Amino acid sequence: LLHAPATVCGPKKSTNLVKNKCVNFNFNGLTGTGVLTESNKKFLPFQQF
Amino acid sequence: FSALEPLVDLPIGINITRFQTLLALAAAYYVGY
Ligand SMILES: *[C@@H]1O[C@H](CO)[C@@H](O)[C@H](O)[C@H]1NC(C)=O
Structure with missing residues (x-):
């Protein structure tokens, strides 16, 4: 520990994806609450949120 | 003007x-700091 910042981490589990309902969400470390819908916004191939 | 995009995060x-x-x-x- 405390040397060579974390590079060997345990597996991360996933669940199903729901839309149009109030659901708690955690998108790769981003915690929030709301309703998720498809959008026409276009990001750049390296932008996450 | 042209912006620089990331590639790697070793x-x-x-x-x-x-x-x-x-x-x-x-x-x-050329080298700058
Ligand atoms: C900087 O290099 C020294 C070795 O010269 C090392 O002990 C130290 O941990 C290094 N610090 C960082 C922030 O990389």
């Missing part, structure tokens, strides 16, 4: 203080 913990450069033995390269 998680290696070495410390860097001085660097160098290769030449394939018309060359010109």
Whole structure:
């Protein structure tokens, strides 16, 4: 520990994806609450949120 | 004007203080801080 910042981490589990309902969400470390819908916004191939 | 996009995020913990450069033995390269 405390040397060579974390590079060997345990597996991360996933669940199903729901839309149009109030659901708690955690998108790769981003915690929030709301309703998720498809959008026409276009990001750049390296932008996450 | 042209912006720079990321490529790599190597998680290696070495410390860097001085660097160098290769030449394939018309060359010109600029260095800023
Ligand atoms: C900087 O390099 C020294 C070795 O010269 C090392 O002990 C130290 O941990 C390094 N610090 C960082 C932040 O990389």
